[PDB]
Structure 1
Amino acid sequence: AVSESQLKKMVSKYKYRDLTVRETVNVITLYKDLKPVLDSYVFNDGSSRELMNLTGTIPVPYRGNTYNIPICLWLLDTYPYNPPICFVKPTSSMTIKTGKHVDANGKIYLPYLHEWKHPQSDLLGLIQVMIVVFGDEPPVFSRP
């Protein structure tokens, strides 16, 4: 019950709508898998706010097979800086291989993303980085 029409109304509060709606579509439309979501956050029950996110899975060649590495997407109206946040949410069967980018908090803080600044930031690359980092050695593994 959240079509493109309703999406606009949900992302109307955002400042960079044209960039927030184009960045998401570009991905979900290219990776034909990422599903758009809308979750509002609160500051210790002191103040709420509308927030959009993207949850889905991304294939990956490993061990001679095609594994799926689930990952979530976070968005902001402008704060703290501007760039969208990244997070991972694997399944109970999967795990979180601690490393340099895949911390124990399902975070994906990458150097390429840390020092990332538009106009090269379209969200399309934000997903590609993981496709490469996870394409060499997926951390979501579960030690079969």
Structure 2
Amino acid sequence: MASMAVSESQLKKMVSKYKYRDLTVRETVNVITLYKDLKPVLDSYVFNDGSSRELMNLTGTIPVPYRGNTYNIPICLWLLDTYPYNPPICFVKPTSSMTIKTGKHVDANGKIYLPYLHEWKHPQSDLLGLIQVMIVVFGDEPPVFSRP
């Protein structure tokens, strides 16, 4: 029904250096088919060691209902080149008009912490599952504020 953003074939070229390419591509297709404001992008990730690698991330918004409105929560999900056997590294990405609300699941840099990420195991864990969890958690406790 809706338009295509990126195809499987194009994605496969983007993750050409990933160790488990078909698995990564299939899950990415399922995510962006369902969440149409999440876009796959190739970008440089800087680890704590100082090393950097070109990684695909999913960036955009997911829809989260909260007290009578539906909010588009901006997120970024980085896929390591060993995806799906390591969890994504996940961030909320506030605009200039937003603040990060820190708590048990979100730090001051916007990094997300979840049992689902800590317990990650393929094939029981996957991105679709992760996003459902984020929607529940963020629906209970919004991770970005924009008004008093």
Normalising by the residue count of structure 1, what TM-score does the alignment of the two structures yield? 0.86
* RMSD, matched Cα: 2.7
1:22 is displaced (CA, Å) by 1.1
Q: Does the aligned pair in 2 maintain the 1:72–1:88 contact within 8 Å?
A: yes
Instruction: Tell me the distance in 2 between the aligned counterparts of 1:43 and 1:60.
Output: 29
For structure 1, the 5+ residue unaligned runs are none
Q: Which moved more, 1:38-47 or 1:9-18?
A: 38-47
SS of aligned partner of 1:126: helix
The alpha carbon displacement at 1:20 in A equals 0.9
Query: What SS is found at the alignment partner of 2:76?
Result: strand
Whole-Å Cα distance in 1 between the matches of residues 91 and 22 of structure 2?
23
The structure whose residues are more often strand, as a share, is: 2
In structure 1, C-alpha distance between the alignment counterparts of 2:124 and 2:56, rounded to whole Å: 21
- Structure-2 change in CA distance of 1:12 and 1:80 (3 Å): closer
Partners of 1:71 and 1:89 within 8 A in 2: yes
Q: Is the 8 A contact 1:101 1:109 kept in 2?
A: yes
Q: Give structure 2 stretches of 5+ with no counterpart.
A: none
Q: CA deviation at 1:46?
A: 7.9
SS at match of 2:41: strand
Change in CA separation of 1:81 and 1:17 when aligned onto 2, cut-off 3 Å: closer
Question: For residues 56-111 of structure 1, what are the alpha-carbon distances to aligned partners after superposition, in whole Å with 9 as ceiling and x for unaligned?
Answer: 11122223111111110101112896222111111111111110011111111112
- Between the aligned residues of both structures, percent identity stands at 100
Moved more, 97-106 or 45-54: 45-54
